Design a protein around this ligand. Structure first.
Ligand SMILES: Nc1ncnc2c1ncn2[C@@H]1O[C@H](COP(=O)(O)O)[C@@H](O)[C@H]1O
Length: 376
């Protein structure tokens, strides 16, 4: 049996072919996705997944996130240099010219950081399978070159996985939607995840996919929506109480989590309450944070982020030499696509209601598992 792993910028997901239906596997914590985050504390204990995510704000120097931006890339790559200016952890030039990360004077390749995450996904699968997992299909963005693909394969190898194939994310997503069995058609894959935005224009010809064009923004993702809201919360709180939370990393840790939670609630509700008891303390005693946030308010806060998905999409269509009319179906990938205003932007972009049929953040792993089943 061959597992399908989406080793994502922000989050990862593992699925496997069970019958004629793929199944996304929950981890021990009951979570269908696992944060692609690896941290090393003062103790030097290693945290992976949610335990690591939970301390990313209080341990910014030694928490590695979005290392997928580094994997397979030379230190001197522009995108690595851009990454350096956006993350608080240390990125270093390895002896061999590659971009690695450092923490507590220890050096790790992005393949090593990936391997920590994959070991967690491998355990998750084995915990369901009841036997060791060896064979895997791993997904990568369509734009990955051979070097990035090879580094991703090496990540899997380190973890004890034989990566039978590396396949592209938009293709994996297309498989999950069954486009495999569709009549010839042009497909837009609109992919807004936690860390990056991708738009792919694919064509299905006789059941086989072709990537006509690709575009996006590697530095536009759900995390930025969370940060925009956290910024609002911090400003509002300071006005409300006089207290500046930017000085307390622990409070910010709690606000960033509450902001993400708020954003997700506003996809199904028009108002949400942000509540953080004993967030800080004053000469009057404990201070509690209590804030109502409407979907209209949240939309206002992140409108620029959403609009940034527009131009990349128009260019992708121009590069694929099609008009909106020529596109037969838009599929949504990435948890962010659950946001109503994002869905509306996608609709305005392509002149059709996007397809919501498959779980947005499970589509890629499901596709991976389908391709796995074939390979097996
Ligand atoms: N129901 C939801 N509403 C809004 N955003 C969500 C929802 N579920 C997940 N997300 C976001 O989508 C991103 C996860 O996408 P991915 O990286 O593809 O797993 C994260 O930034 C989440 O905050």
């Amino acid at each position: 049996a061959v597992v399908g792993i989406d080793l994502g910028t922000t989050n990862s997901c593992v699925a496997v072919m069970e019958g004629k239906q793929a199944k996304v596997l929950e981890n021990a914590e009951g979570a269908r996705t696992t944060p692609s985050v690896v941290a090393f504390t003062a103790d030097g204990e290693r945290l992976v997944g949610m335990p690591a995510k939970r301390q990313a704000v209080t341990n910014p120097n030694n928490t590695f996130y979005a290392t997928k931006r580094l994997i397979g890339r030379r230190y001197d790559d522009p995108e690595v240099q851009k990454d350096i200016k956006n993350v608080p952890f240390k990125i270093v030039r390895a002896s061999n010219g590659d971009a690695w990360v450092e923490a507590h004077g220890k050096l790790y390749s992005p393949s090593q950081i990936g391997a920590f995450v994959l070991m967690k996904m491998k355990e998750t699968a084995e915990n369901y399978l009841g036997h060791t997992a060896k064979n895997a299909v791993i997904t990568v963005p369509a734009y990955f070159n051979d070097s990035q693909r090879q580094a991703t394969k090496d990540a899997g190898q380190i973890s004890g996985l034989n990566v039978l194939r590396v396949i592209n994310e938009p293709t994996a997503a297309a498989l999950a939607y069954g486009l495999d069995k569709s009549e010839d058609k042009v497909i837009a894959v609109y992919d807004l995840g936690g860390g990056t935005f991708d738009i792919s224009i694919l064509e299905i010809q006789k059941g086989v996919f072709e990537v006509k064009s690709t575009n996006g923004d590697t530095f536009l993702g759900g995390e930025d929506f969370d940060q925009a809201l956290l910024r609002h919360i911090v400003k509002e709180f300071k006005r409300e109480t006089g207290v500046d939370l930017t000085k307390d990393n622990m409070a910010l840790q709690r606000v960033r989590e509450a902001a993400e939670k708020a954003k997700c609630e506003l996809s199904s509700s028009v108002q949400t309450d942000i509540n953080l008891p004993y967030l800080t303390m004053d000469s009057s005693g404990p201070k509690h944070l209590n804030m109502k946030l409407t979907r209209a308010q949240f939309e206002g806060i992140v409108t620029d982020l959403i609009r940034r998905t527009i131009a990349p999409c128009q260019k992708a269509m121009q590069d694929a030499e099609v008009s909106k009319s020529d596109i037969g179906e838009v599929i949504l990938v990435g948890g962010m696509t659950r946001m109503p205003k994002v869905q509306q932007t996608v609709q305005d972009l392509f002149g059709r209601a996007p397809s919501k049929a498959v779980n947005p953040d499970e589509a890629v792993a499901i596709g991976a598992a389908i391709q796995g089943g074939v390979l097996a």
